[PDB]
Amino acid sequence: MTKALISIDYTEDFVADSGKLTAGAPAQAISDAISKVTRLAFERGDYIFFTIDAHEENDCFHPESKLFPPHNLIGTSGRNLYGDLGIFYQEHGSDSRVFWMDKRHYSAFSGTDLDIRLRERRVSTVILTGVLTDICVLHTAIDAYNLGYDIEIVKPAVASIWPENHQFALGHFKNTLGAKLVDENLNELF
Amino acid sequence: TKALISIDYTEDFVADSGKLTAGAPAQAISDAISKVTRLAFERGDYIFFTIDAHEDCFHPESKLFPPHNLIGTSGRNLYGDLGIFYQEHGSDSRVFWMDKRHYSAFSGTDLDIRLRERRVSTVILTGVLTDICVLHTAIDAYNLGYDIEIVKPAVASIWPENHQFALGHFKNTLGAKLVDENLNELF
Amino acid sequence: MTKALISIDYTEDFVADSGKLTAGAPAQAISDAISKVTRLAFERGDYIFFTIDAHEDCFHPESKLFPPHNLIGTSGRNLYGDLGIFYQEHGSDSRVFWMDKRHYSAFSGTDLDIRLRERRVSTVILTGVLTDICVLHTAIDAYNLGYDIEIVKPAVASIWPENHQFALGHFKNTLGAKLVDENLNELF
Amino acid sequence: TKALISIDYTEDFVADSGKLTAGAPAQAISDAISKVTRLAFERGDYIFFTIDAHEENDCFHPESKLFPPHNLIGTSGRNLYGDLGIFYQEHGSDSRVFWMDKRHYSAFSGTDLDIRLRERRVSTVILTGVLTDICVLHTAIDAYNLGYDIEIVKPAVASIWPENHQFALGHFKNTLGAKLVDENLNELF
Ligand SMILES: [Zn+2]
Ligand SMILES: [Zn+2]
Ligand SMILES: [Zn+2]
Ligand SMILES: [Zn+2]
């Protein structure tokens, strides 16, 4: 029954209007659902992992730097969590069940110790939230699948810039990864 | 020197009576997939056939798709001229057959090890399906620091909108180069 | 309560007197204990993974370090002693696996971790040869992958007693492994 | 270009008053480890400091039962010992120098080391630090499985137990096919 909720890249740079790689409106639209579900997961005794892009300026060795403009730079406000989710972190970030995790690839597992931390705790299910549905959420989900985790996707708490991409990703999660789609109350959606 | 990965282009995925057939669009790439494989082989590239090998109540994929590519069945035989190429050159030191259980060609296999032994920097992806075993393989390759090439006329999906999502993902997110059956970049 | 026992390279080439990479007397001495403990684990309901060297290869760094051994399709890959009989009896059981490997570690380039995770196995029990090479590498990989570890002391062996002793110390003190006897009871 | 890995050469592992000190043998390599690191840097190599980062009362870490508290985040225990420390003050902000926190013994486990190396097409890793038979050994084995050529700087690795140091060196040479080199990065025969 040991579960972990993963909060992926829900920062000012991905969500806010002035954000450097902002998803804009669709990302902002999930603010209430993402904060509610994360607070709920925490209330249920789940582990919470904030897995956040930590980029550097002039990282010529990173293939991502040629693909997107500078975003989520180390030591910038762009890395601040957006909305009430940010308030949640300031309140509960010191709790032994809440984690902040820097990542450099899209997937929350790549080059991090997420798998190690989950295995230490004998977690068998990950609950995915954040942005973008078809990039960092999708990559994290695929890695989770290959690492043998059960997957839940919080449908109203994931978002993409592109609606067709969001739809592809949701279908992929359900039909290919065998993931459970859930709402903000963590109830399965049929 | 690069490596061409041939993903799941078997009877069960391609033939009209295949257990998990992609049908017409998978059949449509037969000429292109075999042309580009022979071409890559001609110019000294390594060839990795990464093929579903299914049996298995502990595999989560059992719930998601009907039995396909079962061991010892003709369903695992490579489709078309690609099977002919393997019959001719499967024993060449640069050609490989790898059994896999997940979608990604890297998951639970020694693909990364074999590529690293040969100091390969670039993988060229062919096969089916674009949005499942090709997409998963591409993403694993990206995370493992490989340069990626996708042979656009040698990948196929059941649904054209999924094939289009995957192609866009390769270019815009993974930084892959889309190439034609002559291994020339597309513009 | 269900665990996995890993049976590492206990084959003719590593054990038999004419073996291509034979560990000789100390490897032969564990034959009774390794078969006893494997049968006990299987009877208990545990999963059994035979993780066996499958060699061919100028590209393999190991080819320069050891003479040819456990070559694919040769008798050097046959399991040694009563262990071979257990495999004849139960090799087709859904709980028993034969796994080819190219590195020393049973995890490296294999699907061992995946198979264990499918089954929610939290504890691996290690047996076989050599204590300081394929058992050590496998133990280290298991540790980094968050498995609890048991080492069957009378069912592991090395060519050199000092290497065998180093490895056993490393398992207990660094990896936090439980050392057990052939009855799967902890040793004190 | 190669990468030199500097493993756990900190106060807690080296200094007389270190919480998990290897003592005199670890102190004895201070000159060699600092010399070889400055040399690798001069030669244009990448330098990775891979340093234990433990927390007090981490009940979920299996290492917590095995050793007393050591290299705690925000303590002096994590300070690089000797001239290596001075080198880090001098060049830590350089593009080729990296500081990597680790929780397991191996420098690769749960880190982005492999990712950073492959971004640079590094094919050979040069290993230094402590302990020879624990964080150096684990790092070497991980490097081997990941297909890296390995160099071990013999006078720049140390263990608390000399027999364990001897086992590890033999293992590197005979099992991993590593090249043993001196503080001048010249092969030892
Ligand atoms: Zn990013
Ligand atoms: Zn399949
Ligand atoms: Zn071998
Ligand atoms: Zn430590």
Side-chain angles (χ1 to χ4, degrees), chain A residues 2-56 59-173 175-190, chain B residues 1-86 88-170 172-187, chain C residues 2-42 44-56 58-188, chain D residues 1-55 58-189:
Chain A
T2 321
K3 298 189 187 181
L5 185 146
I6 317 303
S7 186
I8 307 161
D9 285 335
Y10 202 75
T11 58
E12 309 283 350
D13 265 0
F14 286 95
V15 188
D17 284 316
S18 57
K20 295 174 169 173
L21 196 65
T22 186
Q28 291 163 33
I30 69 161
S31 192
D32 292 342
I34 198 165
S35 42
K36 194 197 190 306
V37 74
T38 307
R39 287 183 181 278
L40 179 70
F42 184 74
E43 221 97 52
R44 290 186 81 183
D46 291 349
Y47 305 100
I48 311 297
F49 290 83
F50 294 95
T51 62
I52 314 298
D53 261 12
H55 297 300
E56 292 187 75
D59 198 355
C60 56
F61 283 110
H62 199 157
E64 192 188 323
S65 70
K66 289 185 180 181
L67 268 23
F68 298 103
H71 66 271
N72 259 227
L73 307 175
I74 286 171
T76 66
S77 64
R79 298 195 78 233
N80 294 163
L81 290 164
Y82 186 96
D84 185 48
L85 201 66
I87 304 296
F88 173 85
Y89 189 76
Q90 294 305 128
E91 295 180 322
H92 300 285
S94 295
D95 193 276
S96 70
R97 292 188 287 111
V98 182
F99 300 84
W100 182 283
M101 195 173 288
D102 299 338
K103 68 185 179 73
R104 290 176 70 259
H105 290 165
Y106 307 117
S107 169
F109 289 94
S110 192
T112 75
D113 69 337
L114 181 58
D115 191 41
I116 291 165
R117 299 289 197 152
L118 300 169
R119 291 195 190 199
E120 281 178 351
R121 286 147 182 82
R122 301 297 179 205
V123 166
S124 64
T125 305
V126 291
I127 306 156
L128 304 191
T129 60
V131 294
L132 281 74
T133 322
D134 60 308
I135 302 178
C136 291
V137 183
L138 177 65
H139 281 219
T140 302
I142 290 167
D143 272 357
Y145 176 90
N146 289 335
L147 290 160
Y149 291 96
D150 281 354
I151 307 164
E152 291 175 17
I153 308 294
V154 190
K155 187 188 180 190
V158 289
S160 176
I161 301 169
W162 318 279
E164 301 182 51
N165 289 6
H166 176 81
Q167 286 304 119
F168 167 92
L170 290 174
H172 193 83
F173 301 151
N175 302 324
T176 309
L177 309 185
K180 191 181 290 166
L181 303 183
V182 299
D183 61 26
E184 71 275 14
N185 298 312
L186 294 168
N187 297 317
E188 181 165 20
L189 290 164
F190 296 99
Chain B
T1 317
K2 305 178 183 179
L4 186 140
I5 316 303
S6 187
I7 307 165
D8 282 325
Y9 203 74
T10 57
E11 299 288 328
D12 269 352
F13 281 97
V14 188
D16 290 314
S17 57
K19 294 172 184 169
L20 195 62
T21 190
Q27 286 159 38
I29 68 162
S30 190
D31 295 327
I33 200 162
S34 49
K35 188 189 183 187
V36 76
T37 303
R38 288 181 182 272
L39 175 68
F41 180 72
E42 289 164 44
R43 67 173 199 165
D45 290 348
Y46 302 103
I47 317 292
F48 290 89
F49 292 94
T50 59
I51 312 297
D52 257 21
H54 296 307
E55 289 155 341
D56 206 356
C57 52
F58 279 110
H59 201 160
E61 195 190 327
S62 303
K63 275 73 201 160
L64 302 174
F65 302 101
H68 63 274
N69 266 32
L70 302 179
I71 298 152
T73 70
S74 56
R76 293 195 77 238
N77 291 339
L78 292 159
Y79 183 92
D81 181 58
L82 200 64
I84 301 301
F85 168 82
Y86 185 79
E88 295 167 319
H89 301 281
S91 63
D92 190 281
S93 71
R94 310 196 333 282
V95 182
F96 298 83
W97 179 285
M98 288 191 179
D99 294 338
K100 68 179 182 76
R101 283 179 74 257
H102 283 186
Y103 308 116
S104 175
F106 289 94
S107 193
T109 68
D110 69 341
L111 183 57
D112 189 45
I113 290 163
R114 301 283 201 161
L115 293 174
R116 290 195 193 207
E117 281 178 346
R118 284 144 189 85
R119 299 299 184 205
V120 169
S121 69
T122 307
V123 289
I124 308 164
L125 311 185
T126 64
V128 292
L129 300 158
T130 326
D131 60 311
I132 300 173
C133 289
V134 184
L135 176 64
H136 282 221
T137 299
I139 290 165
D140 273 354
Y142 174 82
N143 285 334
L144 289 160
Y146 292 95
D147 291 319
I148 305 154
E149 294 181 7
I150 309 287
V151 190
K152 186 193 163 167
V155 296
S157 179
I158 297 164
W159 284 291
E161 61 270 19
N162 287 1
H163 173 76
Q164 287 304 136
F165 167 89
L167 292 176
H169 195 74
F170 302 151
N172 305 319
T173 300
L174 305 184
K177 181 200 285 168
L178 295 179
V179 297
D180 59 29
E181 68 269 42
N182 305 309
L183 292 164
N184 286 318
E185 181 170 359
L186 291 158
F187 298 88
Chain C
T2 177
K3 303 170 184 183
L5 184 144
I6 317 300
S7 184
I8 306 165
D9 285 323
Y10 203 71
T11 62
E12 299 292 323
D13 269 344
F14 285 102
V15 187
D17 289 293
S18 52
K20 290 178 187 174
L21 188 53
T22 185
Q28 292 164 22
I30 71 160
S31 193
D32 289 344
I34 199 168
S35 53
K36 186 186 182 186
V37 76
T38 302
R39 295 178 175 278
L40 184 70
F42 181 76
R44 262 157 39 121
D46 296 346
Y47 305 98
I48 315 293
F49 293 84
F50 292 94
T51 63
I52 310 297
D53 259 11
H55 295 309
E56 285 165 337
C58 65
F59 280 111
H60 199 344
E62 187 186 332
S63 66
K64 270 77 172 60
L65 297 167
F66 297 99
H69 59 279
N70 271 29
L71 298 181
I72 294 169
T74 67
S75 71
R77 297 195 75 231
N78 298 335
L79 295 166
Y80 183 96
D82 181 68
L83 200 61
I85 308 308
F86 168 82
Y87 189 77
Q88 284 187 295
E89 293 163 340
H90 298 291
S92 285
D93 190 283
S94 70
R95 294 192 279 115
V96 182
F97 302 79
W98 184 283
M99 194 171 282
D100 293 339
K101 68 182 183 70
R102 288 180 69 257
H103 289 163
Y104 309 114
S105 174
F107 289 96
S108 193
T110 69
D111 70 337
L112 182 55
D113 187 47
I114 291 161
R115 299 284 197 157
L116 297 173
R117 293 271 301 159
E118 282 179 343
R119 284 148 187 85
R120 300 303 181 204
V121 169
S122 68
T123 306
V124 295
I125 305 161
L126 308 188
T127 64
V129 294
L130 281 71
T131 322
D132 60 309
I133 302 174
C134 292
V135 183
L136 176 62
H137 287 216
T138 298
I140 289 170
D141 272 350
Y143 177 84
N144 288 334
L145 292 164
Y147 291 96
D148 288 323
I149 301 160
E150 294 177 18
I151 303 292
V152 191
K153 179 170 172 171
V156 294
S158 182
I159 301 170
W160 311 97
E162 61 274 12
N163 290 13
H164 177 74
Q165 291 302 315
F166 166 92
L168 286 177
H170 192 85
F171 301 150
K172 191 189 187 189
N173 301 320
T174 299
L175 309 185
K178 185 183 292 176
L179 306 183
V180 302
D181 60 26
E182 64 266 60
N183 308 305
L184 294 164
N185 290 326
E186 186 168 0
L187 286 158
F188 303 88
Chain D
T1 308
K2 307 176 176 176
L4 184 143
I5 320 300
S6 182
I7 308 162
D8 287 335
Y9 202 73
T10 63
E11 173 180 292
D12 272 346
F13 290 103
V14 186
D16 185 45
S17 69
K19 295 172 179 173
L20 197 58
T21 186
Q27 290 149 22
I29 70 166
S30 193
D31 285 351
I33 197 168
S34 57
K35 177 158 179 48
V36 73
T37 302
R38 290 186 179 276
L39 178 70
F41 184 73
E42 192 191 351
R43 293 187 79 187
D45 294 342
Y46 306 103
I47 313 294
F48 290 84
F49 292 98
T50 62
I51 312 298
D52 253 16
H54 298 308
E55 299 177 75
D58 195 353
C59 59
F60 282 111
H61 198 158
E63 199 188 316
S64 69
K65 301 165 182 274
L66 304 166
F67 299 104
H70 64 276
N71 267 41
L72 305 177
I73 293 163
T75 69
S76 65
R78 300 192 76 236
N79 296 336
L80 292 163
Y81 189 93
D83 180 60
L84 258 194
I86 308 297
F87 167 88
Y88 189 75
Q89 287 182 341
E90 287 171 44
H91 297 287
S93 304
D94 191 278
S95 181
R96 290 182 287 115
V97 183
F98 299 85
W99 181 284
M100 263 177 38
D101 294 330
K102 69 179 179 70
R103 290 181 67 256
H104 287 163
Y105 308 113
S106 166
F108 290 89
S109 188
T111 70
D112 67 339
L113 183 55
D114 186 47
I115 286 164
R116 302 283 198 152
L117 296 172
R118 282 185 49 79
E119 275 177 352
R120 284 146 188 85
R121 301 302 178 202
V122 172
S123 65
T124 158
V125 293
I126 309 163
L127 308 187
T128 64
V130 297
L131 277 71
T132 321
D133 59 308
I134 300 172
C135 292
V136 183
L137 177 65
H138 285 219
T139 300
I141 292 166
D142 270 355
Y144 176 89
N145 288 334
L146 290 161
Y148 292 99
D149 298 304
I150 305 161
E151 289 175 17
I152 309 289
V153 191
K154 190 188 169 174
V157 297
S159 179
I160 175 163
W161 319 276
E163 274 172 33
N164 289 10
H165 182 255
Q166 291 302 309
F167 167 91
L169 291 179
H171 193 85
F172 300 153
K173 196 160 180 178
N174 303 325
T175 298
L176 305 188
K179 181 183 298 164
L180 305 182
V181 302
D182 62 16
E183 72 278 4
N184 301 314
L185 294 167
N186 294 321
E187 186 169 5
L188 299 164
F189 299 93

